[PDB]
Design a protein around this nucleic acid. Structure first.
Ligand SMILES: [Ca+2]
Ligand SMILES: [Ca+2]
Ligand SMILES: [Ca+2]
Length: 341
DNA sequence: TAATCCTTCCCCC
DNA sequence: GGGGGAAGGATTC
């Protein structure tokens, strides 16, 4: 099999540059301003100009300014980006029917048909990198391999703005040499548990007795790693479906008083519905971010579709259930709609 | 600025 | 025992 993974470089900041070329060659930081206090918020993404110095996704907006006090700071604009992305996901469709849109900027292609070997593979990587650069003036990175996991890893290496192949032989050394923590789906926490169990390489997973790996990190995860290590991973490419929509927001001050919260909660549903568009959910969830930054949630399924009027009531009851079964204050509040018709 | 996998529950064959 | 399906939380991106 031969899978080609495509990944957009620092996407949000690149589109920002694209939309005002002057920004070219400068450190651009796409930020999310919570508006709580002076320059409060976080970092959505920074371009190469900023990254290399430390500014990265997750750092506060105040920390970033201490490093690059004079870079460009712009508020995120999901809508525009999302649309830019949509277009690009099309140039690709025009490269196969088997396309999996993993995220707003990640996508996998199943070219096992078209191309005959890694040779023609590269040609198409290039032929593809180009197209998107022409049509939309945006740089990406290609990864090619026996499957989605490596095609992706393939892309993490050759980044930014590169293209890389990882053929069987090389995969082999990776299953052994490649770090366990650098394997897709293994976040700190897991990579951590995998530490104790003495696992540090995909190989290491073959020594331990399954059931101890299962009682630890989970059967799915466990099986996932195994198949990978034994060189038997091969999940196909499928067209994923938005199985949920929501929208959380923050208040100027943490609160516990229901009246003080409602207004925020509604604004949340309001936007959530706008997103929904044409879609009708059967499930609802109120999500609260307590002051200590711990997420608390309460929801409910209905035997029918939820109207907007219904959401307003349902959400105010589930929020009450939250202030009840919890004494902490709320820093953020939002709704999540699922189980569409 | 959603996907997925778990774990525990609560019927009820 | 175990199918089926919330519900709430844990984990990755
Ligand atoms: Ca990226
Ligand atoms: Ca990782
Ligand atoms: Ca908790």
């Amino acid at each position: 099999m031969i899978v080609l993974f495509v990944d957009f470089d620092y996407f949000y900041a690149q589109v920002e540059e694209v939309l005002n070329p002057s920004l070219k060659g400068k450190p651009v930081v796409v930020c999310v301003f919570s508006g709580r206090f002076e320059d409060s918020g976080a970092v959505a993404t920074a371009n190469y100009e900023a990254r290399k110095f430390g500014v990265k996704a997750g750092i506060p907006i105040v920390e970033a300014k201490k490093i690059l006090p004079n870079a460009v700071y712009l508020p995120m604009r999901k809508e525009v980006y999302q649309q830019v992305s949509s277009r690009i996901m099309n140039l690709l469709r025009e490269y196969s029917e088997k396309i999996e849109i993993a995220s707003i900027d990640e996508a996998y292609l199943d070219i096992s048909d078209k191309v005959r070997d890694y040779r023609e593979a590269y040609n198409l990587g290039l032929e593809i990198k180009n197209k998107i650069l022409e049509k939309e003036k945006i740089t990406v990175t290609v990864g090619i391999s026996k499957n989605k996991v490596f095609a992706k890893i393939a892309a993490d290496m050759a980044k930014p703005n590169g293209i890389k192949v990882i053929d069987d032989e090389e995969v082999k050394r990776l299953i052994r040499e490649l770090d366990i923590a650098d394997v897709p789906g293994i976040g700190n926490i897991t990579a951590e548990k995998l530490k104790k169990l003495g696992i540090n390489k995909l190989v290491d997973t073959l020594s331990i007795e399954f059931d101890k790996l299962k009682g630890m990190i989970g059967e799915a995860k466990a099986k996932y790693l195994i198949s990978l290590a034994r060189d038997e991973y091969n999940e196909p490419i499928r067209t994923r479906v938005r199985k949920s929509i929501g929208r959380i927001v923050t208040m100027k001050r943490n609160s516990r008083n229901l009246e003080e919260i409602k207004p925020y909660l509604f604004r949340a549903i309001e936007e959530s519905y706008y997103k929904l568009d044409k879609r009708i959910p059967k499930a609802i969830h109120v999500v609260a971010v307590t002051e200590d930054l711990d997420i608390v949630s309460r929801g409910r399924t209905f035997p029918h579709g939820i109207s907007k009027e219904t959401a307003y009531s349902e959400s105010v009851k589930l929020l009450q259930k939250i202030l009840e079964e919890d004494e902490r204050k709320i820093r953020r509040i939002g709704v999540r709609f699922s189980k569409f018709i």
